[PDB]
Symmetry: C2
Subunit: 218 residues, 2 copies
Amino acid sequence: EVLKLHGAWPSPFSCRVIWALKLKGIPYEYVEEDLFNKSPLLLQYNPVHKKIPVLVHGGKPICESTIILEYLDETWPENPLLPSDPHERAVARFWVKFIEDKGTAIWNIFRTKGEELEKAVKNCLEVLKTIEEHAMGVSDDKYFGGDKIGIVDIAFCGIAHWLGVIEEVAGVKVLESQKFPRLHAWTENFKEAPIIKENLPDRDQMTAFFKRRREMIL
Amino acid sequence: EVLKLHGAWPSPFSCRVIWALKLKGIPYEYVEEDLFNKSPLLLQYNPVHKKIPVLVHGGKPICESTIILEYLDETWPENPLLPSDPHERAVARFWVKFIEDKGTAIWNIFRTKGEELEKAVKNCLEVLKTIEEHAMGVSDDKYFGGDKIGIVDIAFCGIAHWLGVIEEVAGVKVLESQKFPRLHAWTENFKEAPIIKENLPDRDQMTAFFKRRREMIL
């Protein structure tokens, strides 16, 4: 069955799926989708939200990055992203949903100035604090998945890699190592992981790309 | 292992779990939680959102109604709420997430008047239209789960039962049978299902309860 991933190179959400595919070593064909002028296939595949990623297996589309990750686990069980224990799965699903629900708190820094910027920074700091204080282990593990990358690690990839770009692009500091030390350590450990590291879109290049987009929003 | 469900009787979210427990016939102890002055257990169990439902198994809490439903399926596989096929599970998960993301569109009618009410009715109609046009089967099935109740049926229970109360309480019409005929048929079939029917909180009583709460918000 032909497997195609429709994505966009600077999207954290598309990158989640790239990572998940690469951690399992599943072959796929990648398709870049323009987001200003959308393709007929994107609109056919995702009539409800019209967003990437879409994973298409045997011509059948699956929308939503988090839902795609679960589908990958069910169809290719080797190297699970989900914990095996049902209680632990439930807690991991909680943090995936949480970051889905709060993810705007990253992206609002990106597109605001002045006093609405000062407010977005405030909302973002509360999300980070909640993760720092409630989501991190009772354990000595590197990753939310233990000694290997799991679904919460992937779901938090925005925090690990995109927030720092967006901070620099908006001219603010948010995720400071001394404030969120456990989350900070995790970001460094995540990005230094094999497979993650080799598939991180270039920081400096994303920074220039988002710099351009921010100006042309302000 | 002792199983306790912390809930509130008029909550659609608590009722999801009641239904799921009852469809599988899992014994549990129910605990009503006040929502104005929250208990220390609720706050201990759900420090992040401080909301019901919480399911507590062997003293270990699980938050989020949708996540609880998945936990029930994994721990008591008899009478699955999830489709077995991974593609079909993925599509069901999509609509569960969708109603989670859009669920405010019910609850904003409940707490608005005048022109913000007229706007909430408009937002709600677009959600209903999206479901009517994209979520309903290519099939002759009664339920989103087929010939039996599944996770999408439960997730949509707000639409089936609470919206009609909230419409009447706010003095508006939204879900009109002639506009959303397939979704309308589904609401009637859902509510007439054994186990669902015997566990629907009383309409007239919810109506008076929410009437009271709306006044004391306006």
